[PDB]
Structures are given as structure tokens and as C-alpha cells.
């Protein structure tokens, strides 16, 4: 579902993608 279309990642998009892609810090928090 949707590849690396190098779409404009404006911080948040950049956040989700950062994850979708690799992940990041933890994203758990409430988990």
C-alpha cells in the first residue's frame, strides 16, 4: 500500500512516514 512516493512530509507526515518506514523513538506512550 503506497510506496516511497517521496511525498511531502511536513513534520507530522514526516513523523508517520518516519515510522511507517522505520519507526522512531517508541510511539508507545499510552501503549
Amino acid at each position: 500500500p503506497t510506496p516511497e512516493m517521496r511525498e511531502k512530509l511536513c513534520g507530522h507526515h514526516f513523523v508517520r512516514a518516519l515510522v511507517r518506514v522505520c519507526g522512531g523513538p517508541r510511539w508507545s506512550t499510552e501503549a
Binding site: 512530509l9 513534520g11 514526516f14 515510522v19 522505520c22
Partner: peptide
């Protein structure tokens, strides 16, 4: 090896899972 601010840089143009693959802390 690092670059500018990825958050800003991808905001204007965008970033591939490759960029993001190297922007993660893992």
C-alpha cells in the same frame, strides 16, 4: 553524512522510505 532539517526538507519536497529509513533513531 547528516543533512539539513528532515522535517522541514521533506515538508517542502518530501522524503522516501529511504530518507526516513536513515532518519529514524534505529
Amino acid at each position: 553524512a547528516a543533512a539539513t532539517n528532515p522535517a522541514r526538507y521533506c515538508c517542502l519536497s518530501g522524503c522516501t522510505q529511504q530518507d526516513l529509513l536513515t532518519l529514524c533513531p534505529y
